[PDB]
From Swiss-Prot, chain A:
It is a peripheral membrane protein. The lineage of its organism: Eukaryota, Fungi, Dikarya, Ascomycota, Saccharomycotina. The chain holds residues 754 to 1317 of 1317 of the full protein. This is Nucleoporin NUP145C. It comes from Saccharomyces cerevisiae (strain ATCC 204508 / S288c) (Baker's yeast). It is found in: Nucleus, Nuclear pore complex; Nucleus membrane.
From Swiss-Prot, chain B:
InterPro entries: Sec13/Seh1_fam, WD40/YVTN_repeat-like_dom_sf, WD40_repeat_dom_sf, WD40_rpt. The lineage of its organism: Eukaryota, Fungi, Dikarya, Ascomycota, Saccharomycotina. This is Protein transport protein SEC13. It is a peripheral membrane protein. It comes from Saccharomyces cerevisiae (strain ATCC 204508 / S288c). PROSITE patterns: WD_REPEATS_2 (PS50082), WD_REPEATS_REGION (PS50294). It is found in: Cytoplasmic vesicle, COPII-coated vesicle membrane; Endoplasmic reticulum membrane; Nucleus, Nuclear pore complex; Vacuole membrane. Present with 21400 molecules/cell in log phase SD medium. Keywords: Cytoplasmic vesicle, Endoplasmic reticulum, ER-Golgi transport, Membrane, mRNA transport, Nuclear pore complex, Nucleus, Protein transport, Repeat, Translocation, Transport, Vacuole, WD repeat. WD repeats lie at residues 1-39, 44-85, 90-131, 136-176, 183-225, 233-272. GO terms for molecular function: structural molecule activity.
Length: 503, 274
C-alpha cells in the first residue's frame, strides 16, 4: 500500500517508513532548467522593464508595456553555451534594430534596417560555421576548392587573393562580385553554366560551383549545390543562400524561407526552429503550434519569452489563448520551483482577466508569508497586487496562527471577543462609524457614556460563549457602579452568587 | 514504531502535518524541512484511522478524520491543546474518505462509508451538525472528492466500479445525482477532481484493476471522454490519484512502491514526467 496527494505548495507526500513521520516532503523535480531564474536580481531588473496597469474588468494587475528582448537575457548566460546561441540568434532575427543616423525618407530607413539585420545574421552564421570550414580548408589538396571554401566563410577578399596567388586571376575578378546583387552578372553566370551544361566537354568541379554562386540561385538550380547537403552543416548552405542568393529582391524572411523550401532541417535542432519561425512570418503561430507537437527543442520559458517579445513589439501575432497557454505553463513550472514571486510576475501576462484573478489570488493568499521579506519582495507586492487581496490573505494567516487594522479597513464579533483599552475601544467605535452588530454598537455607545434597549440588545448578543459572558459581567459591573427604585429593579430583571448577594 | 500510516495531510500553509496510521492514533507534526517535530498524538478511534483532512483556516484549526470504527471524528486545536469537538457516525460501516468542501460553501464535510453512503455535514450556528445524507453506491464507497466551481458537485468512486457525479439542488435539498460513469472491472479505489479552472475539467479515476481512466469533459454540456491513461495494466493494484493545483499534473500511488506522474500534452494524451 502507498498513498500520495499533491500539497497546497504543489509538492508530494508519500508513504516513507524511513523518516520520522511516515511520510516524505518531496521537492517536486522541476522541469525549469535555467540557472539565472533562481537568482532574484534577474527578476528585479525584469520587472524594471514592465508597465503594469489594472484591468478593465477587475482591479488585478496585467501587463500593459513590456521592453523585454532576447538581448536582455544574454548577460546571464555563458557566451559559450548553445543556449546563448539560441537567445542570440533570436535577438538578431527578432529584436528591433535601431539605426541612429537620420534618413531622408522612411522607406530608406526600412532598407537600411534590412541591410544591418542581414549583415549581423550573416556575420553570426559565419561565427558558427567557422571551425567546420576551417577544418575543411585544412584538409583540401586543391586550390580552387579552397577558394570556394573561403566563399563558404563569406570571405570574398581571401578567395580573390588565393585565386590571384594560385594564378587564377579572371576568377579572382569574378569573385569580387559576390555580395553585390548585380542581375547582369547573375544571368551571365547562369548563361555560362548552361553553355557548359550543354556540350562543355569538361569544366573544373569547383569553378562551376563558384559560377553557381554568382548565379544567385545555388540550389534553386540546374547545376545545383543541393548535393552539398551531404557535405556541409545545413546552416553552412543557408549562409550561401543568404549571402549571394538574391538579397535585394527578397525580404530577409522570404529569402530564408526560399532556402528552407529546398531543405528539410532536423526536427530536434532548435536554431533550425528559430529560422523556421522567423521565415514563417505570415503564420508564425501556425508553425509554432506545429513546432510544439513535434519537438521539445523550445522549452517552456523560451516559448513564453518569445511569444511575449513578439506580442509587445508588434513583431508578430499570437492568439490570446496561445499566449496564455505559454504563460500558464511557465508560471506553473516556476511555482513548482518555489519561485512564487516570479510565477506571480509571469501570471500577469495573462489576457483572460478571470483566470489572472484566480491564479494571482490563490497564490498570494496561499503564500503571503514568503512574499513579504525583502524589497525585491516588496516591489513584488507593489506589482499592483490589490490592497484587498494582500491584507485579506494576511487576515487569514492571523486567524490560522491565533490584523485588527486590516479588519477595520461574525468575524468582527469574534475579534471583539478576542479583545475582551478605553482608547482602543474609542478607535474601534470611530472605525465602525466611518464604515457605516448593532447590539455591540449600542453597548459601545453606552460604555463611552434607551438604557433598557441597550441592555436587551446586549442580552441578545450574549445569547448569540466566553466573551459573551465576559461582556455580561462587565455590564453588571457597570450597572452596579451606576447604582452606587422601581426603575432599578426593572434594570436588574459566580454570576448567580453575585445576583444572590445583590438580592 | 510506525510501520503503516494510511494517510497524511498538509495544512493550507504547510507548517503542520497530520499523519494517521493503523494503531488508531493521529500524530501532528510541526514540519521544517528535514525536521518534523512531533507535537501531538490523538487517540479517539476504535480502529485504523484511514484518512485525515484539515479544513480551511477560515474555520480556525479543524481536522476531520475518518476511521475503521465507522465514526467520523472532528478535532480542533484549542490554545495549543487538542479536543474532539464533534463526531458524525451515521454510517453503519468503515468510513473511508473525508474531504472538506471549498470554503465558499461554508464548512461542509464529505464523508464516504462502506454502507454505500456519502454525507455532507454542515456545522450550524451552535457548531452542531446538520447531516443531509444520500445513498451513493451499492456494495460500498471507497472514495469521494469535491469539485471547485463558480451548482456545486462532487465525485464518488464505488465498489461497483462506478464513478458518480452529484450536484446540489434547491428543489431536492439533497444532492441529486446527475451523471454516472462506467469503466473499471474492480473496486474504484480513488477518484479526484482537478482544481484547474481551465477550458475543461479533468478527473483521474484510479482503480483496483490497475487502470486509471481520465474523464475529460469538454464543458458544461457534452458528456465526459474516457481515456485509459496508458493501455497496459500497472504492475500492481493502484490506490491513490491526486491532481496538482498549479499545472494539472497527475500523481498516481500504485501499490508498486513508487509514485508516477503524468502530464497532459498537446495530443491531449498523457505522458510521464519526473
Amino acid at each position: 500500500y502507498t498513498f500520495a496527494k499533491f500539497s497546497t505548495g504543489s509538492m508530494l507526500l508519500t508513504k516513507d517508513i524511513v523518516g520520522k513521520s511516515g511520510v516524505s516532503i518531496k521537492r517536486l523535480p522541476t522541469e525549469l532548467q535555467r540557472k539565472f531564474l533562481f537568482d532574484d536580481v534577474y527578476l528585479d531588473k525584469e520587472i524594471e522593464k514592465v508597465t503594469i496597469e489594472a484591468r478593465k474588468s477587475n482591479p488585478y494587475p496585467q501587463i500593459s508595456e513590456s521592453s523585454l528582448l532576447f538581448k536582455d537575457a544574454l548577460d546571464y548566460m555563458e557566451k559559450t553555451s548553445s543556449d546563448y546561441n539560441l537567445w542570440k540568434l533570436s535577438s538578431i532575427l527578432f529584436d528591433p534594430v535601431s539605426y541612429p543616423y537620420k534618413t531622408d525618407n522612411d522607406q530608406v530607413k526600412m532598407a537600411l534596417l534590412k541591410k544591418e539585420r542581414h549583415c549581423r545574421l550573416t556575420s553570426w552564421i559565419v561565427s558558427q560555421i567557422g571551425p567546420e570550414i576551417e577544418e575543411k580548408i585544412r584538409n583540401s589538396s586543391n586550390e580552387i576548392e579552397q577558394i570556394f571554401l573561403y566563399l563558404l566563410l563569406n570571405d570574398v577578399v581571401r578567395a580573390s587573393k588565393l585565386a590571384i596567388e594560385s594564378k587564377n586571376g579572371h576568377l579572382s575578378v569574378l569573385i569580387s562580385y559576390l555580395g553585390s546583387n548585380d542581375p547582369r552578372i547573375r544571368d551571365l553566370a547562369e548563361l555560362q553554366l548552361q553553355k557548359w551544361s550543354t556540350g562543355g566537354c569538361s569544366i573544373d568541379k569547383n569553378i562551376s560551383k563558384i559560377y553557381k554562386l554568382l548565379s544567385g540561385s545555388p540550389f534553386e538550380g540546374l547545376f545545383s549545390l543541393k548535393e552539398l547537403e551531404s557535405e556541409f552543416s545545413w546552416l553552412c548552405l543557408l549562409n550561401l543562400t543568404l549571402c549571394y542568393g538574391q538579397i535585394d529582391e527578397y525580404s530577409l524572411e522570404s529569402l530564408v524561407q526560399s532556402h528552407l523550401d529546398k531543405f528539410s532541417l532536423p526536427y530536434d535542432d532548435p536554431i533550425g526552429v528559430i529560422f523556421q519561425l522567423y521565415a514563417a512570418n505570415e503564420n508564425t503561430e501556425k508553425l509554432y503550434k506545429e513546432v510544439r507537437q513535434r519537438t521539445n527543442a523550445l522549452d517552456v520559458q523560451f516559448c513564453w519569452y518569445l511569444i511575449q517579445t513578439l506580442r509587445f513589439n508588434g513583431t508578430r501575432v499570437f492568439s490570446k489563448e496561445t499566449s496564455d497557454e505559454a504563460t500558464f505553463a511557465f508560471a506553473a513550472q516556476l511555482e513548482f520551483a518555489q519561485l512564487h514571486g516570479h510565477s506571480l510576475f509571469v501570471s500577469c501576462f495573462l489576457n483572460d482577466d478571470k483566470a489572472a484573478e484566480d491564479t494571482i489570488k490563490r497564490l498570494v493568499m496561499r503564500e503571503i508569508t514568503l512574499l513579504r521579506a525583502s524589497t525585491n519582495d516588496h516591489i513584488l507586492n507593489r506589482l499592483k497586487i490589490p490592497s484587498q487581496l494582500i491584507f485579506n490573505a494576511q487576515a487569514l494567516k492571523d486567524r490560522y496562527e491565533g490584523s485588527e487594522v486590516q479588519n477595520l479597513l461574525d468575524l468582527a464579533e469574534m475579534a471583539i471577543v478576542t479583545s475582551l483599552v478605553q482608547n482602543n475601544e474609542l478607535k474601534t467605535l470611530r472605525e465602525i462609524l466611518n464604515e457605516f452588530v448593532s447590539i455591540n454598537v449600542f453597548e459601545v455607545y453606552l460604555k463611552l457614556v434607551q438604557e433598557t434597549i441597550d441592555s436587551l440588545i446586549s442580552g441578545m448578543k450574549i445569547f448569540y460563549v466566553a466573551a459573551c459572558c465576559n461582556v455580561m459581567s462587565q455590564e453588571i459591573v457597570s450597572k452596579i457602579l451606576e447604582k452606587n427604585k422601581a426603575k432599578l429593579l426593572e434594570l436588574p430583571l459566580q454570576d448567580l452568587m453575585k445576583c444572590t448577594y445583590k438580592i | 514504531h510506525n510501520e503503516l500510516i494510511h494517510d497524511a495531510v498538509l495544512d493550507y500553509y504547510g507548517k503542520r502535518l497530520a499523519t494517521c496510521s493503523s494503531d488508531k492514533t493521529i500524530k501532528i507534526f510541526e514540519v521544517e524541512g528535514e525536521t518534523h517535530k512531533l507535537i501531538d498524538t490523538l487517540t479517539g478511534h476504535e480502529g485504523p484511522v484511514w484518512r485525515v483532512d484539515w479544513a480551511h483556516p477560515k474555520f480556525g484549526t479543524i481536522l476531520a478524520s475518518c476511521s475503521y470504527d465507522g465514526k467520523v471524528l472532528i478535532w480542533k486545536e484549542e490554545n495549543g491543546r487538542w479536543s474532539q469537538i464533534a463526531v458524525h457516525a451515521v454510517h453503519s460501516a468503515s468510513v473511508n474518505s473525508v474531504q472538506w468542501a471549498p470554503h465558499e460553501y461554508g464548512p461542509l464535510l464529505l464523508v464516504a462509508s462502506s454502507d454505500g453512503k456519502v454525507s455532507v455535514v454542515e456545522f450550524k450556528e451552535n457548531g452542531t451538525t446538520s447531516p443531509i445524507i444520500i445513498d451513493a453506491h451499492a456494495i460500498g464507497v471507497n472514495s469521494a472528492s469535491w469539485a471547485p466551481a463558480t451548482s456545486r458537485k462532487f465525485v464518488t468512486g464505488g465498489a461497483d466500479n462506478l464513478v458518480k457525479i452529484w450536484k446540489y439542488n434547491s428543489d431536492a435539498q439533497t444532492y441529486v445525482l446527475e451523471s454516472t460513469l462506467e469503466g473499471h472491472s474492480d473496486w474504484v479505489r480513488d477518484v479526484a477532481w482537478s482544481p484547474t479552472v481551465l477550458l475543461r475539467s479533468y478527473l483521474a479515476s484510479v482503480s483496483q484493476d490497475r487502470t486509471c481512466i481520465i474523464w475529460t469533459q469538454d464543458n458544461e454540456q457534452g458528456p465526459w471522454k474516457k481515456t485509459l491513461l496508458k493501455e497496459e495494466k500497472f504492475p500492481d493494484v493502484l490506490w491513490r490519484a491526486s491532481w496538482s493545483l498549479s499545472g494539472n499534473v497527475l500523481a498516481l500511488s500504485g501499490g508498486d512502491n513508487k509514485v508516477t506522474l503524468w502530464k497532459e500534452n498537446l495530443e491531449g494524451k498523457w505522458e510521464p514526467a519526473g
